[PDB]
Amino acid sequence: ASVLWFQGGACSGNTMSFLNADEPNVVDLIVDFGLDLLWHPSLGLELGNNAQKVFWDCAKGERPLDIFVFEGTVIEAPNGTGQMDMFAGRPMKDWVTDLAGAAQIVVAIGDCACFGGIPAMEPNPSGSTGLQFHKREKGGFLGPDFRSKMGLPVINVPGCPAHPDWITQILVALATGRAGDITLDDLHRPETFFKTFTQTGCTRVQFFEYKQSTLSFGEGTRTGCLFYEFGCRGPMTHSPCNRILWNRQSSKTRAGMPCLGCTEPEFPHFDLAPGTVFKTQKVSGMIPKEVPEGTDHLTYMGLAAAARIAAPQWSKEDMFVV
Amino acid sequence: SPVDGIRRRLDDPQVAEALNSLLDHADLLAVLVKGLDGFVRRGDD
Numbered sequence: 110a111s112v113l114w115f116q117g118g119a120c121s122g123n124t125m126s127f128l129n130a131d132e133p134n135v136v137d138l139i140v141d142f143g144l145d146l147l148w149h150p151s152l153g154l155e156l157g158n159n160a161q162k163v164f165w166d167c168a169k170g171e172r173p174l175d176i177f178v179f180e181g182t183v184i185e186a187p188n189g190t191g192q193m194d195m196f197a198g199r200p201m202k203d204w205v206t207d208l209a210g211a212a213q214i215v216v217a218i219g220d221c222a223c224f225g226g227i228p229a230m231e232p233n234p235s236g237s238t239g240l241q242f243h244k245r246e247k248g249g250f251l252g253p254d255f256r257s258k259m260g261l262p263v264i265n266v267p268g269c270p271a272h273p274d275w276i277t278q279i280l281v282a283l284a285t286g287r288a289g290d291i292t293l294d295d296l297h298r299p300e301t302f303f304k305t306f307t308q309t310g311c312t313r314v315q316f317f318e319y320k321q322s323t324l325s326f327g328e329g330t331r332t333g334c335l336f337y338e339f340g341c342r343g344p345m346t347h348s349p350c351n352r353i354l355w356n357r358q359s360s361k362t363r364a365g366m367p368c369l370g371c372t373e374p375e376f377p378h379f380d381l382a383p384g385t386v387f388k389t390q391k392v393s394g395m396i397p398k399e400v401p402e403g404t405d406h407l408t409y410m411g412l413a414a415a416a417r418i419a420a421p422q423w424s425k426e427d428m429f430v431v
Numbered sequence: 432s433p434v435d436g437i438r439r440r441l442d443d444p445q446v447a448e449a450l451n452s453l454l455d456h457a458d459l460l461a462v463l464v465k466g467l468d469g470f471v472r473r474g475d476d
């Protein structure tokens with residue numbers, strides 16, 4: 110299975126995260142799983158005209174392209190020319206057009222590629238967009254009706270960056286005959302990773318249940334949930350970040366950092382407008398503006414009051430102790 | 432006798448039926464009193 114991994118408006122974080130892959134690690138994925146990595150800007154040996162030969166052979170159908178991985182945004186500025194992202198003699202968006210049209214499967218890795226991500230933040234100088242989404246709005250660069258040659262839409266492996274497993278396990282599934290096991294949600298994300306929430310497996314959910322808030326960073330995060338004071342988007346964000354830990358160690362929320370909802374197409378949420386960074390926007394100083402997914406402010410708040418009154422003592426003390 | 436007078440209700444069918452029904456859901460009474468004890472010992476909390 111040939112893989113061509115291109116980077117548009119990328120920071121290469123998805124590649125670096127991918128390189129952190131374990132079980133399989135990246136080398137075993139590239140070699141031992143029958144995935145022929147044709148080229149990758151961070152890893153491909155070919156430069157210049159040899160690399161362009163590889164790209165053109167993929168684009169024109171001279172050689173098969175099974176998986177086109179795209180990382181980074183599709184940069185369309187200036188004026189829709191895409192010349193703020195010139196790659197191998199073309200605007201990167203033209204490469205995207207050709208290769209997405211050539212690939213059996215197109216995988217957008219990372220929010221930039223999936224939805225536009227950080228570069229698509231206003232004022233979006235690069236005219237960045239995702240492959241098939243611009244933020245939540247379906248269509249992105251390739252249009253809502255784009256399908257790869259295997260009939261799939263762009264497989265969106267979101268995250269900023271995506272966790273290595275979010276792509277590697279998909280690649281293994283494709284390589285092991287389990288492509289049919291891959292189900293995609295409405296954002297084209299693999300449901301095997303994105304039916305759960307970041308909160309799922311968060312070490313602070315018991316504090317969340319009892320509405321015990323982390324009050325401060327550092328040692329303050331030895332207790333409490335980050336939802337109330339730090340804008341944790343865990344309960345509104347689909348991800349397996351607390352199921353499949355980052356770097357096989359931790360997750361933002363475990364570590365005391367609020368989930369920024371990076372697997373969600375709106376990321377960065379509120380465009381990091383003043384007062385929204387590591388803060389919970391609240392109505393009347395008590396009611397979070399955004400409640401967990403599938404809840405309503407009145408039942409949430411009622412249950413929150415009930416949970417506060419019935420809170421056990423341990424939920425009000427440090428638990429992640431030295 | 433007073434104590435034998437209650438011992439007579441013990442062999443009274445309807446009284447026996449009700450007492451045996453109290454012994455049926457005795458667990459629930461125990462758990463509600465345990466819940467009350469718990470709530471009391473966590474009343475400060």
Ligand code: F3S
Nearest residue numbers: 120122219220221270
């Ligand atoms: S990791 Fe980097 S490539 Fe985009 S998805 Fe995040 S800015």
Ligand code: F3S
Nearest residue numbers: 311334335336341343
């Ligand atoms: S339970 Fe965890 S995911 Fe965030 S909302 Fe609380 S720190």
Ligand code: F3S
Nearest residue numbers: 348350368369370371
């Ligand atoms: S910011 Fe992203 S990496 Fe996981 S903890 Fe939140 S979905």
